[PDB]
Amino acid sequence: RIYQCHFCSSPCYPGHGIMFVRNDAKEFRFCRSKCHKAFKQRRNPRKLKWTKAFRKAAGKELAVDSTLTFAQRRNVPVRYNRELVATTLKAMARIEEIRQKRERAFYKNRMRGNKEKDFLRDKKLVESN
Amino acid sequence: MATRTQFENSNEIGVFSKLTNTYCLVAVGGSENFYSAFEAELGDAIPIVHTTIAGTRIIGRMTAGNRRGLLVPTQTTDQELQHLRNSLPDSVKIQRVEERLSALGNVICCNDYVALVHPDIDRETEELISDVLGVEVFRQTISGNILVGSYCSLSNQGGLVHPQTSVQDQEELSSLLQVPLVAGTVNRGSSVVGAGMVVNDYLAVTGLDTTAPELSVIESIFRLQD
Amino acid sequence: GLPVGAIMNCADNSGARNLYIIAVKGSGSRLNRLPAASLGDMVMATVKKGKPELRKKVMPAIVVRQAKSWRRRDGVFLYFEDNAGVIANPKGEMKGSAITGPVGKECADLWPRVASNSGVVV
Amino acid sequence: LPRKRAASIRARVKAFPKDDRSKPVALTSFLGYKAGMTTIVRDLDRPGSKFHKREVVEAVTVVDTPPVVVVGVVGYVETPRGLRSLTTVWAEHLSDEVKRRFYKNWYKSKKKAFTKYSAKYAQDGAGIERELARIKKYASVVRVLVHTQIRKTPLAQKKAHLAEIQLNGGSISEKVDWAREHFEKTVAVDSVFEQNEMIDAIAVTKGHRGYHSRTSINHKIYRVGKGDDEANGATSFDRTKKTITPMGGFVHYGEIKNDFIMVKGCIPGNRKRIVTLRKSLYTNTSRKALEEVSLKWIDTASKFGKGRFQTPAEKHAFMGTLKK
RNA sequence: UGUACAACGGGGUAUUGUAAGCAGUAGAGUAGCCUUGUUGUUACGAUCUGCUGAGAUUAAGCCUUUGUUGUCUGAUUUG
RNA sequence: AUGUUACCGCAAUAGUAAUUGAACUUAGUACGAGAGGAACAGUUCAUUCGGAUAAUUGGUUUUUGCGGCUGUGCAUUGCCGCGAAGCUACCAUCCGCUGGAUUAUGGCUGAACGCCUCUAAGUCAGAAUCCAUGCUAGAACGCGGUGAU
Numbered sequence A: 001r002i003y004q005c006h007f008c009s010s011p012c013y014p015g016h017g018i019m020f021v022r023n024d025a026k027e028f029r030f031c032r033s034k035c036h037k038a039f040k041q042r043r044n045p046r047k048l049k050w051t052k053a054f055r056k057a058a059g060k061e062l063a064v065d066s067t068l069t070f071a072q073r074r075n076v077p078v079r080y081n082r083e084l085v086a087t088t089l090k091a092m093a094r095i096e097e098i099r100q101k102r103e104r105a106f107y108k109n110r111m112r113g114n115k116e117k118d119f120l121r122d123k124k125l126v127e128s129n
Numbered sequence B: 001m002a003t004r005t006q007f008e009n010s011n012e013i014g015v016f017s018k019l020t021n022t023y024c025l026v027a028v029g030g031s032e033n034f035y036s037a038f039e040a041e042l043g044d045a046i047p048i049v050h051t052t053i054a055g056t057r058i059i060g061r062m063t064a065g066n067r068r069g070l071l072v073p074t075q076t077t078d079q080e081l082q083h084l085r086n087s088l089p090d091s092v093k094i095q096r097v098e099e100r101l102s103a104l105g106n107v108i109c110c111n112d113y114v115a116l117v118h119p120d121i122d123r124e125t126e127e128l129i130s131d132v133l134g135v136e137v138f139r140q141t142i143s144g145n146i147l148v149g150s151y152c153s154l155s156n157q158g159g160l161v162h163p164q165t166s167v168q169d170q171e172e173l174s175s176l177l178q179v180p181l182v183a184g185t186v187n188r189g190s191s192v193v194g195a196g197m198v199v200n201d202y203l204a205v206t207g208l209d210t211t212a213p214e215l216s217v218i219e220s221i222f223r224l225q226d
Numbered sequence C: 001g002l003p004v005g006a007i008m009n010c011a012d013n014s015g016a017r018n019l020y021i022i023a024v025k026g027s028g029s030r031l032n033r034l035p036a037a038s039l040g041d042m043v044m045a046t047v048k049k050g051k052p053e054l055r056k057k058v059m060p061a062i063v064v065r066q067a068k069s070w071r072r073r074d075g076v077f078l079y080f081e082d083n084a085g086v087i088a089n090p091k092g093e094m095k096g097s098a099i100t101g102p103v104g105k106e107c108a109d110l111w112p113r114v115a116s117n118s119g120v121v122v
Numbered sequence D: 001l002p003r004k005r006a007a008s009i010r011a012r013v014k015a016f017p018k019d020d021r022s023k024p025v026a027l028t029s030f031l032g033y034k035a036g037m038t039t040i041v042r043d044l045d046r047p048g049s050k051f052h053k054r055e056v057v058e059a060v061t062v063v064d065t066p067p068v069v070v071v072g073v074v075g076y077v078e079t080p081r082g083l084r085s086l087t088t089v090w091a092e093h094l095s096d097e098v099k100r101r102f103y104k105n106w107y108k109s110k111k112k113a114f115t116k117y118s119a120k121y122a123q124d125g126a127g128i129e130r131e132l133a134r135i136k137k138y139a140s141v142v143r144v145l146v147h148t149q150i151r152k153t154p155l156a157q158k159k160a161h162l163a164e165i166q167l168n169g170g171s172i173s174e175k176v177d178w179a180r181e182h183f184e185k186t187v188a189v190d191s192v193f194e195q196n197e198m199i200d201a202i203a204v205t206k207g208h209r210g211y212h213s214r215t216s217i218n219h220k221i222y223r224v225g226k227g228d229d230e231a232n233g234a235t236s237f238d239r240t241k242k243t244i245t246p247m248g249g250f251v252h253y254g255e256i257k258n259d260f261i262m263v264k265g266c267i268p269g270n271r272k273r274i275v276t277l278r279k280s281l282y283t284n285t286s287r288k289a290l291e292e293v294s295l296k297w298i299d300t301a302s303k304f305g306k307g308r309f310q311t312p313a314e315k316h317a318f319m320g321t322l323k324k
Numbered sequence E: 001u002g003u004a005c006a007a008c009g010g011g012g013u014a015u016u017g018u019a020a021g022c023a024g025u026a027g028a029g030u031a032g033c034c035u036u037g038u039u040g041u042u043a044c045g046a047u048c049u050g051c052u053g054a055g056a057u058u059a060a061g062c063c064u065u066u067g068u069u070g071u072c073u074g075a076u077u078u079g
Numbered sequence F: 001a002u003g004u005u006a007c008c009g010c011a012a013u014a015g016u017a018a019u020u021g022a023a024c025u026u027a028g029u030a031c032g033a034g035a036g037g038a039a040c041a042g043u044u045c046a047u048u049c050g051g052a053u054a055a056u057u058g059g060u061u062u063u064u065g066c067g068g069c070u071g072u073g074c075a076u077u078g079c080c081g082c083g084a085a086g087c088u089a090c091c092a093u094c095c096g097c098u099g100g101a102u103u104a105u106g107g108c109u110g111a112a113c114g115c116c117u118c119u120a121a122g123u124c125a126g127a128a129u130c131c132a133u134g135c136u137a138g139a140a141c142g143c144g145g146u147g148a149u
């Protein structure tokens, strides 16, 4: 079972990271001791630029996609269907492709506007003289 | 009908086992003597399921359910959870509970109609009990004890409480239950009656050290003889 | 995580505040080492503050919170917020009716009665 | 024991397992090169243990397995003074790795190693076939001469290693004929070793004290991984298409594009080291021997730092796009 | 005189945590200017935001290299 | 050093062989009126020892790797944030409870002597004793096979 890092949002694995449990039984997994010591100092990941609290709070990547509707922890279990398994495998591969495509094309929106503002700003370095 | 049973040189029964009308949950640890003991009792009528809950032999305190539903905590792994879903039929509902505490057999005691809960449970689990189990929910302490399952054993036959329960408290609580109550000892003086024994509407299973007066109490209030 | 001479919390509702361990039951014998308690360990512990009836008397107590990161069998390193123990008999039958705070999974697997009085497991 | 250093860095096999002549003719050991260590998730199937049907995480050691090739045989006859080889038999075409092994100054030698031996197949084989029939006739026990495909390995030494292997199949004549067909051809461990095999490891440990021959026994093989598999790091649970190679590769070693053996526990010696994998000297039946393990997940992250991904596709999927 | 070696270069992996510099109305406020404001705006303004998981390290005992470039030799001993 | 050289080996010989406990089951049975309660096997962990090991956990030296601090030429690694690599650690992990013949000693059944007895027949345990097996080293003046000259 893959969990996220509490401080990175990075996938936590067996053997990887430290868990802290408060008195209210809330488990917090950290992928590394940088995350763990950052939590020890009571720091905000919204302050640290590299972690995904800042990046999903900032708008570098898209954060809501219609591809995200498929990944969710389900508390009611489903009986075993072998025939749904390969369809879910194809779904995971295809949806990860579509997510990377939408993320790259979302970054493709960012780089075009600097051309426009560089045009508008190098007009200011010409038209004054 | 009351059968003394032992698990790994321990008289505790509801710790390692979970008994409803329609199924039984057993641990995988130690030996198949305790499982064959229930096979002698229950047999082919209801499915008896070996399980762990987040890698535990302790499952009756971890789980709280009726004939219609079964509630499992957050830490239940989905391999175990899929094995429980493939194990138990469509008539039994299974759902993980996202809440602070994990132990459910201490915190929720129920039958097919009425559940007593931890009076300081969150409201979401108080929703989910009456949703899945289809039972009536009451915030209540048995003699001021906030763990309601280990200190009070329930079925649709009747109920059994620990001996520190006042008779005023027994009537106060049996008005909510509409099934009778007896202050009872189990396993030679152990007040923990919910983990010391399990019961459903045709069977009560307890430890070896549950004495014959205690067995007469259980056989009377849960009507083990027809 | 706790050697001999360690103050730990009291998570049952008996009335003690803190439990001071003076001996560890079932520890090895090596020169200059300390008998170290951990999760799922019954040790002799004395009550420092609380009711004086529980004070000035040692009691056996099982540790439910450790706060030092151990290696569980499934891959995880994890530790509680603090150190905590609950006092009981040598038979493992609890004194407290309800044990507050999170109780360790190995400790509740070890003792059936502690799990019978456990409210919060992990 | 007095701690004097090892004689050769390739440690000697002083004892081999017992000859069963009712089994087909097959090897008894192997020489590989240890790449490194990682961590494996699997389920424990041990009734009597509380950890039965429970996820365990286990340290393993992986040895790179290039396919080994047979170039000769050696028959030993019994004397009242001990074992003695009456002769050794070579094949004709031997690599520059092996001809390098005989030489100290290969870079400036005229490379004259087995020239006139190649004239012994210029004939019909009369002396050679006389010797094969002699080892059929005499020489009760048979050892084969094998060397590794060290050019298929990230080792900087182009000089491969030669070793003897006692051949515990049946029929000395069929043994030497088996080796006769297997001259200059290859043998993989898949025909020799298998899954769940309790093996012993013979290796020279890490010098710094150290550099001593050590035989650590009873290690269950966990994966006989094939070189052509791109799902080397995969399981029926771990459906990623990934190799056994770590993220960034094995530290100070390189990679494994070859076959490999992932075996339980630890092992004497370091990385880049020649290690003999021998099958057990007896049929262990301890239930630690009989266990048919079933893996779940393979760590393939970086040990060059605190790793946080398994595949780089996972890395790009989490981190998204970059400025570069 | 070769999948040869080596100096670079490149790619991979990991470390640290947004480089320098540009822009601002974002900035607690102080003066300044009138068009005395229903954000009127111009100067100082620790800092903040976007360019920017950016910038820096990366084997000295990490891995790889269809790219470049140079290289290949003397002294002693034996039948 | 034994014409040389190189590899693969053999083995005269030297040493070396893991301590202690409890968890299921055999069991709530044999047994015992009960009280209570076995053991041989078959599984599971612990202690201790020995040997390895860095995947991970933790410590540690050389870091002068990244970012940052405090100054007056300096801070005995100036400090700190976050980290490598190596060494090391039941602080982390893995593997190793090798088999027979025996001495003293403790016994059984059991006559010789109608009681009696470890002995006369036979036999159980038990020393660092002896052998086997495995491991480590290899006669530097032990040996063999094989290459080219």
Ligand SMILES: [Zn+2]
Binding pocket: A005, A006, A007, A008, A009, A010, A030, A031, A032, A035
């Ligand atoms: Zn993290």
